[PDB]
Each structure stands twice: as structure tokens, then as C-alpha cells.
Amino acid sequence: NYRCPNPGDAFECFESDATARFCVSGKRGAYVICSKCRRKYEFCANGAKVSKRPEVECRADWASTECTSENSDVPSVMK
Numbered sequence: 680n681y682r683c684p685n686p687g688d689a690f691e692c693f694e695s696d697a698t699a700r701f702c703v704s705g706k707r708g709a710y711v712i713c714s715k716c717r718r719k720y721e722f723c724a725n726g727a728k729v730s731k732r733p734e735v736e737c738r739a740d741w742a743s744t745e746c747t748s749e750n751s752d753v754p755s756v757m758k
């Protein structure tokens with residue numbers, strides 16, 4: 680599976696790296712998230728791609744950002 684789910688479809692993803700930090704940049708701006716599943720979600724939902732310049736677009740300490748429910752959790756269904 681590699682295609683973004685459609686609105687109303689369950690967002691089903693096997694997490695392999697829950698504590699990985701990613702500076703993503705899309706329609707809601709640039710910010711840090713945690714986990715590969717939330718990284719996939721940010722791409723499908725916000726057009727947020729992993730920054731090629733994370734220290735410029737996020738913060739110099741982006742990789743040390745504490746992972747929380749807010750920056751890690753993925754909605755169960757695609758809005």
C-alpha cells in the first residue's frame with residue numbers, strides 16, 4: 680500500500696519508527712511531527728513534505744523536539 684486514502688477511508692499504517700522526528704512543510708506551514716505514520720498523514724492531508732532544509736524551515740533543535748500526542752497522533756479516518 681502506497682496511495683493516500685480517500686476521505687472517509689480508515690488511515691491504516693504499520694508504524695516502524697514512532698520516535699523519528701520529521702520537519703514537514705505544507706499548507707499549514709512548517710512544523711515538527713513524530714513517527715512515519717504521521718509523516719505519511721501530513722503528506723496526504725496537508726501536502727506537507729519532509730523539509731530538505733529542516734533547520735531553516737523549523738528550528739535548529741528540530742530533531743530533539745519532544746514527541747507528544749499532538750505532534751504524533753494520526754486521525755483514524757481521512758477527513
Ligand SMILES: *C(=O)CCCC[C@@H]1SC[C@@H]2NC(=O)N[C@@H]21
Nearest residue numbers: 686687688689754755756757758
Ligand atoms: C471535520 O472535522 C468534520 C468531520 C465530520 C465527521 C462526522 S461527525 C459525525 C460522525 N462521527 C464521527 O466520529 N465522525 C463523523
